[PDB]
Design a protein around this ligand. Structure first.
Ligand SMILES: [Ca+2]
Length: 123
């Protein structure tokens, strides 16, 4: 467990601002509903494990020591998404948006396309 606060996420996701048409308040909203802002969120559900603040699965995007069938499109080890530096997470997230789009994150369409004003930080 290692969470950031809304305002910290707003500071650390600065590169994604505008990328793929998605604003910062959408990403701040999306990520709360995706991982609670916890950089070491790990969720195994059935056939895949999902890592970090962005919940990137070891199925298509990264290499996992316990799943050799991965496509590893991000060409990285999934554990590098469990640390405190979101620099590479952001790189992976740009490849996902290139290939799949922001709808990889279900909270976006469901809870974060409307009324983004509460997700603001002038702090
Ligand atoms: Ca990282």
């Amino acid at each position: 467990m290692e969470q950031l606060t809304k305002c910290e996420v707003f500071r650390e996701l600065k590169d994604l601002k505008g990328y793929g048409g998605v604003s910062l308040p959408e990403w701040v909203c999306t990520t709360f509903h995706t991982s609670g802002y916890d950089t070491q969120a790990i969720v195994q559900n059935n056939d895949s494990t999902e890592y970090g603040l962005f919940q990137i699965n070891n199925k298509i995007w990264c290499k996992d020591d316990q799943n050799p069938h991965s496509s590893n499109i991000c060409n990285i080890s999934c554990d590098k998404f469990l640390d405190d530096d979101l620099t590479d997470d952001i790189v992976c997230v740009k490849k996902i948006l290139d290939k799949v789009g922001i709808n990889y994150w279900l909270a976006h369409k469901a809870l974060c396309s409307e009324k983004l004003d509460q997700w603001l930080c002038e702090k």
